[PDB]
Every structure is written in C-alpha cells, then in structure tokens.
Symmetry: D2
Subunit: 507 residues, 4 copies
C-alpha cells in the first residue's frame, strides 16, 4: 500500500490510514464493502475505504435531516461564516489535498491544487452570497397587501460526483447548498474514495469546532447501489448528479418519478472552431491545452476541432510539433504536463476508439498508442480525415483523442457544433465582430458555455456552469445557480380588513 | 340543435365560430383528425364542433412552427413585445364575448370568465415591458482582457398543454412570456374547451397576419392524449408546458426527461386554509367561501382542506354553513350568479361518489352533498366535518366542491398537516400573530409555492411566479423571473486581448 | 395675426388649444402670470398665447399636488401603471396632431416630432410592466428571527423642468416613471414650447379626470426662470428633475443641494464620433451626417466633434461634403424634408457668431456657414476642418448645426480627446477591432454615460438608463433602474421573534 | 508623558505606533503639516502624536493615487476582491490590539472597539463575493444586430472623510466597496482619531506592499478642515464620501456640486423610537436603554427621541430609571463596563448646556443630567420627560447621552412627529399590530433610511444599504447596490451588423 510506504507518508496529514471509514454523519463508520483505490500513475494500491451499507445510508439520512432542523434555523450569513471557515481549512491543506488528487485521480499537481483552490474560491464567494440570497418584494395590485418572493432551503441535497473533478464539483454544490440552508449527503466516485474521505474530514472538523452536527455535510461512500438509493429517496429533496449521460438519464428519471428535484451535469462533446481570421498563435496552444489537459478527461475537454480549410493543414502541423513536446510523467512531478488515464479500462477504451476511428477513414496523425511505462499512460492523439457526423466522433469516451475536421462556412460549422446530443462547452476563434455576436445569439452555439478566443475549458466560479440537451440542464456555482438549491414561494400578506380580489373580480 | 345555430347565441359568430370549426392553425387553418362536439355544462346542450389534429396535422404544424421560428427569433425582443401588446389589445376588444364563451363552454360564472381574459390582457401588458428587460448580467471576469457575459436565448418551440378549468389564462401566461422570449408556441388545449382554444387562436392569428408574421408563431393543434403524448415524446418540442392532472403530468414529465427535454409542470393542488384562534373571522368566512366554491371548486388552487383551531371551529363552520346558503345559483352568464355547474356529467358522478365515501369514512355532511335538481351539471357546494386530517377521502384528487374541515390545536402540527399532502400548490393561514406569520413564510412553514396570509388560496396576480412544489410539478408561470424557463442560459467568455496563454515550456511558433 | 386663427392650422383645436390658453393646471386651469406668445420658427409668426403661472399659482399648485399625493401614493403601483397605460393610449390617439404641434412650435421635422410622442407612448407601455416590478430584495438577516427588507417608497412631489429641444419625450420619461413610482408631478416646460406643454397636459388631465383622480397628480405651471428658481428652492419639491443648459443646471443643482433636496440633472453634451482606420465608411458617413444635422443640430446627443483617423480623414470629409449638399431643407411638416429651422432668431445670430469665431481660430468652413434667405430661422448645416481638438470654439456649448472635424493617429490619444471636454453625455467609435471596442467600454475608455460602437451619438432607446457624467450632471432617465431616483430606499429590519436582548448584567 | 511611552501601553507598538507617527501614506510615509497630539477621553492624557498632511503632501498623494489607479483599475475585480480578502485577514490578526486602540483614543467600550474592527472584517469578506458580481444587465435592443449593455466602471479616486465616533468601520465600508469597484482611495480621518487612522493604514499598507501593489491604492492624508476642504474642491477626487455633521456635510455637498463631482453624504440622525400600547415592554425597555446610552450616546443612530403611548408612558419611564441606575460606568477597556466617556471636553459642556436648556424649555430630568466626578469626560446618561415633541432642544443636534421622552395618542400624529425633524437616518417602532407595521414601512410611514420594527434605531447590518434621507444627506454605504455609488454607469450599444442606415433620399 502506498500509504504504508515512507515516500507517501504525507497522506497522514489528511488523516488517512491504511483502512478508512467511508461514512460520516457526526460519527465515522462504514459497514459496507471495503474498496481499495489505486494510483493510476503506477497501478499500485494506495489505501482502503469501508463504504456505506444500506443501514449506514438510512442512519445518515435520518441524522442529516435531524441536523437540518438545527442548520435551517441558523441565519444564512452565519451559515456563510461556517463556509468561510471551510474555505480556510481547505486553504491550510491545499498542497497535500491537491497532491492526493494527483495521486488517487491522476491529474497533474497544478490542477489538483487548482481544484482545491476552486473550492476555496467558491467558499469565499458563498460568504458574500449568504447575505444576498432572496427574492423581490413586489408591488401587489391590491391595497393593503404585501407581495413577497421568499426562498427557503429544499432540505437535504444529495450530491453524486465523478472521478475527474473529485473535489471541485462537490465543493460547488456544498458551498452553495450550505449557505442556502440545506444539509448535504455526498456519494463520491468510488475510485476517488480517499479524496472524498479527506475532504469530508476537513469539513467535519470545522462543523465540530463550531459545535454543529456533523451530518450537515454527510458522506456515504459507495457506488451505483448508494447512488440509486439517493435517486429513489423521497427524503433527498435535491439530487445533484455529475457523471455520464447514461447514468444521469436513469437518475433523472428516478428523481422525476418521485417528483423530486434533480440537477444534472452530464457529458460534453465540446468543439473548438478556428475561423480563417483567427490568431493561430492563440489557436494552437488553446487547442493543445484544451485537448490534452487532464489527459482529455474533463467534461469540457476539446474533443472536436473544426478548422477552416484555408488553415486546416497549417494548424494540424503546428499541433503535431507542439504535441511532440508535451512532457509526460508522474502527475505530481514538476513541469509534468500530461499524466495517466484514470483506469486500466479507459486505456482499453482509448485503444478501441482509436481502432474504430481508423476503421471509419480517420488518419491517426499523432499518438494512438499505449505508452510503454507503468500506469495508465496513452499518447495524446490527433485524428484527421473523418466527417463531422462520423460515429466515432459522436461516441462518448473519456480519451485524449482530438478529432479534427475541415469546414468552409460559418452557418454549416455552427450547425455542426450544435448537431451532437450534448451541449456543454463550445469555442470559436475569430476576430470578426459580427460572427462573435451571431455565435452568442439565437442562431449560434446551443451550449451552456459559449466562448470566444478562449478554449472549451475557460470558466470561472462567477458564472453558472452547466450545459443543455443531453448535458442535463443543471447549473452550478455562480450567477443565480443558488436558486436550484432552494424553494421559491410567492407570498401575499393581507394586512388590511377587506378582501380585494386580483383582476378586479367582484364576488 | 346546436347552441351556435340557435338565435339566442348569435354572439358566438363574433368570435369567428361556426357550426364546425377547424382545430388546427399553423398559418393556415384545418384539421384531419377526429371531430369533437363540446357541450354547455349549464344545460348539457351541444354548442359546436371542432375538427381536431391528426398526428400528421401535428407533424406538419411542428415543421411550420420551427420554420416560423427562424423568422421570429431574429425579431428584437422589444418588437416581439409590441406584437404581444397588440394581442392584449385584441383581447381587450373582445373581452366580453370571449368571457361569455368561457362561461358557456367551460361553465364558470361570467365575472370569472371575463376575469380570466383580463389575466391574459394583464400578462400581455406586463410582457411588453419585460421584453425590454429579459437577459442576464455582464459579470467581472477574473481574467484580464476577458469579458464575462450571461446570455439568454429562446429554447425554440414551446409546446403548451392546458386544462379545461382555465382555458384562456394559463395558455395566455405561457404564450405572452414564451413570445417575448423569442419562442414559437404550439397549443394543445383541453378537448372540452376546444371552442375557447379556437376563439383565442383566431384573435391571435389576426394580429400575426396583420403584422405579416408567419401564423405558426402561435400554432394550435386541438387534440387529446394522442397529441399530448406526441408532444411529450417530440424532441422538436424544446419546452413542454403542461397544466393538468398529477397522474398525467407525471407521465409527461417522465417522457420529457427520457429525451432530455425541458418541461414546466403545473399540476394539482390539495390546498389548505388554516384559521388560528386569533384569526379575523370576517376575513376567514368569505375567504374560505370564495376559495372553496369559486369556479364550483374546480381551480387548481381551490381550498380543499379547512383547518380551524378547536376554539373557533364550530363558530366558523356555522358561519360558513349560513354563507353557503346565501350563494346565488344560476346560469353562469346570468347576472348576480355566483355559482355555476360542474364542467362535466362525470364530475357530478364522481362528486356523489366522494360525498358517499366521505360519509363511509366517518364524515358528517353539514351542508350540501346532493345534486341540484335543475338542468345542467349542478351540485350543492358541500362541507364535511369530523374526518381525521389523514382521512383517505381528503387525500383524493377530486375536482369537486367538497370542503373538508379539520380541527387542530397547535401551530407545529397544523403546519405539518398542511405539508403532509403529495401536492404543494397553495396554502393560506389566517392569523394576526407576527411571529406565526414569519414562521409560516420560513423554512419550517408552508412547503407550497403559494404561501398566503389572510386571503384565500386562489386568485393569484400576475406579478409573481405561479406554481407549486412536490407533486404539483415544480414549474412556474407568469411573473418574477419565470421567463427563464422559456430560455436557455449561456455563460460566455470573450477574450478580446492580444494576450497568449502561458507556453508551459512548449516551444510554439 | 395668430397662426391658430388661420384656417391652415385649424387642427390645433383638436389638441384643445385656442387663441389664449391657460398655462396652469392643478385640477383646475388658470394662470395669473405674464402672457407669453410662442412663435413658429419656420416662419416667425405667432402661433397662440399662454398665460403663465404666477408665484401664487405655483404656491397653490404645490399645495394641491401634495394633497393629491395622499390619494395617489395609496394607489397600488400596478393600478398606477394602468393609469400610465391609459396615458399611452390617449397619446397614441393624438400622435399625429401632437407630433405636428411639436414641429410647428419647436421646429423639428414631423417624423421626429411624431417619434417624440411615440417615445412617450413607448415609455408608458414600458412603465406598465415596471409598475409590477419596482421594489427591493428581501435579504437574509444575520439575526435569528429578524426579517431584512429593502423597501422603496415615492419621494412625493417630483418637479420636472424640461427644455425646448425635446418638449414631449423628456417630460414623458420623467412622468411615466415618477407616476408608477407613486409620485405626483409638477411640470415647468420651456417657455418657447408652452403650447406643447399645455397640449400634453390636457391629454393627461383628461385621463386623470376620466379615472376620477385629482388632476394635480400631473400638475402644470408654465413659466420661466422665475418658476424654475422657485422649484429649485422649494423644500416641498422632493425631487427636481432638470433638463437644460449646464450653466442653469449647475445653479439648480446647488439650490437643491443647499436645501438637502434631490436633483436629477440632464445637462449639455459635447459629443464626439471617432472613426478609426478600419471603420466601415459607408456606415460612418451617414451616421455622422444624421447625428450632426438631425434636429438641426439641437439635440443633447448631437455630434459636435468628428475625429477621423489621418489615413481616412480626407475621404470622409469629402464624402460628408457631398452628402450635406443633398440634405433636403424645407418646412418641418413637409414630408420630404430632413432639415428644419433653428428654434429661435437668437440661435441664428449665435450660429453666425460661432462660424465667424471658428474661422478666426484657424478653421475652414468646408460646407455651409450661412443663413438661408427664406422665412424662419434656417441656417446651412456646417462642417469645419483644420481646428485643433482644444480650439476654444469647439468647447463652446452652442446649439448650432456646426460639426468640428479633427484628425488623430492612435487610440490612446483620441480616447483622451473624447474625455477632455467638461461634459460626458454620449460618444461613439466606428471600428471593427474587438479589443479596441472592449477597451472603449472599459475603465480606460469613454467616460460618457452613453458609449456607442458603430452607431452615432444619438438615438438611444428606452430600455437603458439615459444621461451623462461630468458636467452633464449625473442624472438618469427612462430604463434600467433609473426608477430608483424617483423613490426613497429604506432598509427595514423586522424583529418577529420573542427574543429578549442580552441583559448585559442589568436586571430588567 | 505620552501614554505610549508608559510601559503598560506597550501594546500600542503592536500596531506600529510610536511617540510621533507619520500621518501621510501614499506608498511612502510622511507628513510635513502640523503635529497633532491625540488624547484618551477616559483620563484626558495624551497618547501619542501624528504629523499631519500639508497641502504639498496632499498634492503628492493625489498624484500618486491617480497613478496607482491606472494599475489598479486594470486588475480584474475578483483579483481586487482577493486583495480585500487579505485586508480582512490582516485586520483579523490585529483585531484585539486595534479594538483596544479604538477604545483608548476614541473612548467606546472595548466590545464595540473590537466589534467595529469585526465590521470591517465582515464587509471585506462580503466584498470578496461582490467582486465577482458587480455589473449591469445585458438588455434586448429594439434594433436588429445591436447589443445593448449596461457597463459599470470605477469612478477613479474616492476620497473618504470620516468622523471620530466610528473611526474604523465607516472607512472600512467605503474602502472595501470602493476597492473591489476598481477605485483607489484617499482617507482623511477625524483628527482626534489620527492614531486609529494611522494604525488601520499600516495594516492595509502591508497587504498592498506584500502583493507588490502601489500603496497609494489606499492613501492616507491625516488632517482637519483644510485637507477635507481641499478634497471637497478637488476635481481629481471623483467621489467624496463624507461622514460627519450636517453643517459641514452641507458645505461639502455644495463644494462637490459646484465642480460637478459626486458626493456620498452620511450626516446626522435625530432618531426616534416609538412604543405603542401593544408593545412588548420587556423588549422596549432594554432596547431603548441600549440604543440611547450605547457609545455614550455618540452614534449616528443613537435613540434621541422616545415616543411612548400615554397608557404605558409612566411605566416605561419608571422601568427605564430602574435600569439606567444599573449602567456600569468605567474605563472603556475594563471588563463588564457598559458606559464610557464622551469623546471630548467640548462634548461635556455641550451636554451641560443641553440639560439646562431642556430644563428651561420645560423638561424634567428624571435620571442623570450631571457631569461625573472622575478623570475623563464622563457624564451621566440622561432621561428628560415633559417636553413637547416640537421643543427646540429635542431638535438640536447634540452628541449627548440625553434621551428625550414624549407622550403620544394616535398612530398618525406620532408618525408625523417621527418625520418632522430635519434628518432622516434611523427609526423604530415597537408594536404587535400587523397593519401598523406595514403602514410604518409604507409611503405614509417613516421617512428614514432605516425603518425598524421591534428592534431599536441601531439595528443595521452590512447586507443592507446604510444611510438616510433629508438632512442625513442621501448617501448609502455597505450592502444592497450601494456599490453603484462608487462606479459610473454607461449604456452601451454595439452595432455588430453590416446594416447601413436608411439613406433617406441621399446618394452616399
Ligand atoms: Cl504553434
Ligand atoms: Cl424593565
């Protein structure tokens, strides 16, 4: 076990042990199956987590809804103060926590640290928002009536997250849901159970130091069984789900079946489009980093690169010369730009996708092979010569394969951006003012993130994050995404002694 | 003979109605589907007929609406607002005859029929201003040389399914908002209010054609479960607004979720009024009366459950019984008439069924419970005491004028009892206690989407969002930022600088 | 003889005007002050007369307005919005004759006169929806059992002083918003547009009287500096909205500040258009012509300064020169006419003086510079090249159709030159450069209240807030949250709990 | 001997203070003006000295701040928020010694000195989130191919003048908001709290310096009326936020108005509490006591007028007297002290004068009214009954702990009496009546900026905008959209279409 090797002793700074309890609700436990998580950079086991049994889930839900009775009564600004302290406790652990993200998930250290910083940043944002959430006081049309839009917590927010952002997506949901007066129940990705435990330990200490019931931020580590329970559980007032479209579809249906609320953040099949007037010294690095970043395992990863015919072959050749320089190595080591895939299965998926892409006329112009070293390393791959509607370019595989397409006119390539089932992120690179505003308008991108001269991964906590179509429609983080965590009521207070009716109806 | 052919009802022609009307409008009028005849519930006489849409009619209409959308979405929202303004004027010019048609085909009294058309006129006048306001913030990017912009664009085609009990206003709320938001609309109204749907569409069609706009911007495809199911399963319907039963809304919500579409669900209510010991009873009794017997108990927001504190229970019931006796019954178009018939013969049959089962469950009918002996679908507005709050008959979704009265003692329990039902539409308390009022409005208070104090559960204005939680389906219509459900948000980052990203050790050119 | 007594102008009666009109309305019509005669600037003939407010008229009008406010403030905002809707319809119905009156008394062409009424109609319809929206947030209190609410209430009496050049729309902007916000209004329009103020007031008064509301809700006291000074010094005028010259607006602003009142100041502009080298010149030339010559150069947003990049300076002046020669001049009601007369004889004399001074400072008149030899106050629309951007004549506030053309090289200096004038109303750049556009909109860009790209300095729409910075005075009208200037904010904490305060060792 | 030179006050050096301190900071520390000595009101002993700003110091500081602004305005608002976050943390780490300095130099009890620093901390943390939120709407243009955008940009240099009674929090409110809004600041604190201003400025200076930012982003120029007047007249001060007396604030408003600047004025309050028949007396009596005697009655929001209904008047006054006798007077740094000295010797004689004047005008001193026989500026907290609501001393603006108590009969007259004073800062009613509470909050209710229910006149939190109406000056600080006063609005139209304007007969 890596945690039992002196090189990884720093894992104990996060309170991690050989075997860890994967259930927290004020108390720590775990009566379900023990899971070992592996370091994808060497395929070695790191440590073990005792996951939630059904009995653990039940006890946790009950204790979190008991906790909600206390927490919902705490003024939102004082809830913000708790979230501020969570930000600070995360700030104090950012290097080791980020290193664990690199160790258990596989992304490079700057992105592991960056993910914790994002949670830090959303906490600091939530502090201010906790003094702002609410609705309008509106002028009633009736004398002696007040008309008020109130917002109240939904109660228990269940949060299912994925392996590729094992800290930040939970942090987005947690910070906003907390200041909105909800309790949280977290089921993280099984293959990032240690990250889930570490984060939960950080939060639990803040809650306990403030003499708040720990179940405000409950954890039930588990897989599809616990997640299915959450989706089915009328006690989970909002289920925020981040993951695959196939799973998210079933989750959305189960929540809809019980008239629950769901917040779905699912796949992206994101395109970058480089027009003829584009700054190629901006296009080439923007595409490389958006395609190879996180080894192509981001929901926002650039999977499709449309290049205008006039510059297609130049951009491809400059991409090859730049791909050749990507520094591959251990994700925690300095100046490493490219790490492993998360699992051995994703390497098998990479190989399958590469063989099928060639079987559809594509030319692997760079990469396409597994790397001959320990861990789940594959070459960042560029495939040209496919048609935009090719089956392989509409399949959903978290693989570092960049499909490059030619295009000729603005209307057709906008349609090509919009033609896929998902709708997360999109980018155009152009200088044409009219084109930019058309891209942003009703006949433009159909995505939740619509970028210009910045790649598909450019997104900051200030705006709402999420997509349309098969991406599932949810939003996280900024703008008024907080309303998804609360219940709107339209309230009328008659403080007079008559009964005027709306629309002047005389009854 | 049909009512429209009787001289008594020559005014139906002023709405463009004929003996047989086309129930499909997409810029042209038609319909190859089943012919339906609607009946006047005040006298069970047939009014006129409508040729409904076939699946092929609906297929053709979707195609023409989405063609129309290419034109409409290019029209600036304020100029779309001007078209909506003209619809509100065109409704104003016909408010009396349209109100009369609502009273005739649906059965609510005239002032409520006109009042429902006024709701549509009001949201039109409201949407005019909103058309110059919809949109999002420009935000400060954390990146130098970047702009961060929240854009809002139309979803495209908004399918609108409505019910019989509000055959004008609910479509009007959806239509005026969806229109200024740059969407085209496709309306499948309630089969038993087909003439109202045709009459409304004829008013809108003239405004669109007078403005040389494609008529499919406000398409109409009359039909029933076949057309509604097609809309729920049609990926081309970007947003499906459904008002109606929880049972059907459940399946519609599932069908839309299965195809990753958008739905806006406005389903039932099982709405409570709670009268605390300090309540002004001169507000309680007229409010409970209107909330329960308005529209013959057929509103989504009708008061079904009357919770009265033990101390004032008998007094309130006695006053309510007396007030019920003073209810003026007649033809819903007649003057001073405050109580009309139920919408259908079936509603009468189910009403008698509910009354009997409530008796079998231990209730006492303290007023009503019988059919009225007169033409049409008239039943006595009915009050039942003595049931437990958990009585099965009081947790049935029946559209009947039966008010279930319960006693209670303390505030915490009756708040929980308000909340214990599946639905969560509207709720009201009568009290003077400041602390009680803010508790009711707070996180431990009513779980409903409409949370009222010292007024009935029904009769919302357009300024706020309208809708419920839980099995009411979660959608919102009309006011506040309800318009966002009709549009798609995009978070847009524009790099306007000459700045290049960090080379990260890579040698570019 | 009065134009109103001639048969060609009988339509004036449709607006309820007669030979001598009452310039005070407070529910009753009157006017014990001096009688003013307004003149058609197209022919210098007298139109009709208006009896202005005496100071006793004004005092009685303030009293009646504040009495009317007690009723009006109690009317729910959305029902006040319905009154404003009806005002929009009443204007809609008289739009042609009221537009024609604006052209007759003020001098602008009919299409703009009608369009000014339509602007009032448009803000009325905007205000109808806004009447269901004005208010503030309910906010989460940091204290358990406390509600925190931001309330907005009418300030009370809104005094409105308007200028001759937009004698309908500016009042309309202030009226519609002030009215849905629960204020009563007192209007003192420009003396030279007194008939228009009376005609507008008659239309609104009919709406109020038909709804059985006190007419003093929209009071009128026609008068000049005497009544305007009284308003500026009157503690009972809770908000004074002033549209006018910077010189007068400065003194109004100080008078209101002296009494701790609220003012809203919409003062002059010295508005620049900047044409960069990459600009679409077929967009620049018509935009510049219509922004400089529209309303005979008498808008607050008129283009006064045309900075052209040195590379295209000569082409644009030449293209502009050929375009000016095609401007159709005539009576402002004649349909083909683009260019009307200036508003007064005095404006002609001052235009000629601005031209001569511009030549003395090194300018070359490349087009115009002269009076036209027809009746009325017509001058040629004028282009002056050769002056430096700091030329004194270029920084004089004169309401004359004189367009000063400057050269420039780079973006930093020309942004600085846009910003160097005392006023800060409107500004426009023409360019295709993405970064330059967003720099123009950013903190190192235009310092004006209106910041336009590829469109001229005039023609704003009701959806946004209208107004300027610096010596333009800071006020905002019309859209966005400009309504907040017409209301008072209160931050309201409601303790609804039974909690006692901490005793701090004291036995209570 | 200076207190700072006495061993028991060695903790003052934890704030970087010494015998004589530089009162000018602009990236460099300096001060060529007059040396001022500040005194501890608990014992009238000198604490330490500050070298104030000369005019040359002011000039150099304005120049350096305007240079710094060119850098600071280019830093993204959220990165400016991160600087303000670190200011919050830096204040956290000094909260105890800084709170103690507030208690020493200004005289308020220690929990309020600490609490004032905590208020700056809290607004910093709030502004961090606000820094990712400030901006305006993108609006739907009525014209095809046009974007319509409401932009907000920093005004530039925000001058901030503050008073003795909140020598940290008021600057904090202005500083944190102005900073995230992209402005640089120039602070002139009250001369008698010069050491507090220096201490705060040292804390901020280290944050700016550690982040390699020019210190003049948060400049300090210690001084009195001469420096404040310079700021009021200086066109380079784009916004002048002033907190102080109405008399000075009026002149500051006039001076800024004279140059077409922006001011934000937070002036006196003459704040009333109203207790109706149905009020919870267990809540009224402590609420009135703490609101009246808090900070020895030297708050802007201090309860000066207490209206009690005739039925409960004598009972409330009796209970107030029993509780007033329990107020623990002492050194403001000593534990469990509720009540400290007045800020100055001058304030004591003012207190004396008002007490005899209330007597002469017909009032009865039921409690207090005398100077206390101890070191420092201690006077007794005073209750005065029997005056009419219009009694002239109750409309005098004194920072004295004198609570004037009045009888009332009905709701209408007492609402009018709350409103009759010249200021309009804070107001409170105690009642259970639901209709009355909404009338109080409505257009016929309180005319103040703060309108409270069952919580006294000092009920304010950073989430809401803070300020008042009428002679209180109109400014707002802290919450809601108060940030907009620190920025300039522009309404921006971008034409991104290839569409040409109508030629209107002209051949371009
Ligand atoms: Cl390159
Ligand atoms: Cl007491």
């Amino acid at each position: 076990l890596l945690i039992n090797q002196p090189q990884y002793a720093w894992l104990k700074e996060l309170g991690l042990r050989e075997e860890n309890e994967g259930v927290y609700n004020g108390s720590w436990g775990g009566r379900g199956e023990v899971i070992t998580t592996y370091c994808p950079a060497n395929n070695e086991p790191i440590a073990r987590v005792r996951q939630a049994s059904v009995a653990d889930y039940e006890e946790t839900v009950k204790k979190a809804r008991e906790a909600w009775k206390i927490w919902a009564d705490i003024p939102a600004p004082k809830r913000g103060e708790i979230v501020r302290q969570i930000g600070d406790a995360l700030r104090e652990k950012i290097q080791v926590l980020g290193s664990l993200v690199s160790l258990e998930m596989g992304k490079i250290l700057v992105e592991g640290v960056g993910e914790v910083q994002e949670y830090v940043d959303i906490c600091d944002y939530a502090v201010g928002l906790s003094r702002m959430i609410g609705g309008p006081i509106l002028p009633s049309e009736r004398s002696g009536h007040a008309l008020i839009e109130q917002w109240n917590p939904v109660g228990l927010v269940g949060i299912i997250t994925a392996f590729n952002f094992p800290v930040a997506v939970y942090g987005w949901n947690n910070a906003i849901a907390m200041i909105c007066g909800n309790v949280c129940l977290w089921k993280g990705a099984p293959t990032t159970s240690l990250i889930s435990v570490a984060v939960t330990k950080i939060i639990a200490k803040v809650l306990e130091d403030n003499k708040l019931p720990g179940a405000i931020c409950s954890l039930t580590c588990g897989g599809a069984d616990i997640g299915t329970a959450m989706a089915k559980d009328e006690r989970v007032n909002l289920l925020s789900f981040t993951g695959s479209t196939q799973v998210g579809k079933q989750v959305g249906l189960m929540v809809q079946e019980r008239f629950g609320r769901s917040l779905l953040e699912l796949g992206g099949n994101n395109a970058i489009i480089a027009f003829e007037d584009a700054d190629l010294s901006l296009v080439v690095p923007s595409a490389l980093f958006a395609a190879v970043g996180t080894a192509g395992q981001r929901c926002t990863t650039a999977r499709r690169l449309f290049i205008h015919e006039s510059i297609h072959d130049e951009v491809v050749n400059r991409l090859k010369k730049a791909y050749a320089q990507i520094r591959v190595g251990n994700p925690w080591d300095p100046n490493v730009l490219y790490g492993p895939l998360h699992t051995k299965q994703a390497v098998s998926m990479f190989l399958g996708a590469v063989e099928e892409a060639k079987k559809e006329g594509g030319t692997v112009v760079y990469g396409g092979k597994v790397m001959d070293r320990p861990g789940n390393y594959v070459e960042p791959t560029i495939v040209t010569g496919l048609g935009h509607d090719a089956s392989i370019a509409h399949t959903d595989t978290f693989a570092p394969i960049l499909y490059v397409f030619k295009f000729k006119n603005e209307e057709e390539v906008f349609a090509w951006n919009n033609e896929v089932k998902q709708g997360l992120s999109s980018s155009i690179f152009t200088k044409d003012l009219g084109r930019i505003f058309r891209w942003l308008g009703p006949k433009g991108s159909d995505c939740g993130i619509v970028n210009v001269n910045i790649p598909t991964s450019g997104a900051e906590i200030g705006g709402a994050f999420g997509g349309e179509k098969h991406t599932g429609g949810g939003r996280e983080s900024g703008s008024d995404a907080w309303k998804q965590y609360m219940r709107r009521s339209t309230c009328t207070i008659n403080y007079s002694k008559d009964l005027p009716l709306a629309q002047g109806i005389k009854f």
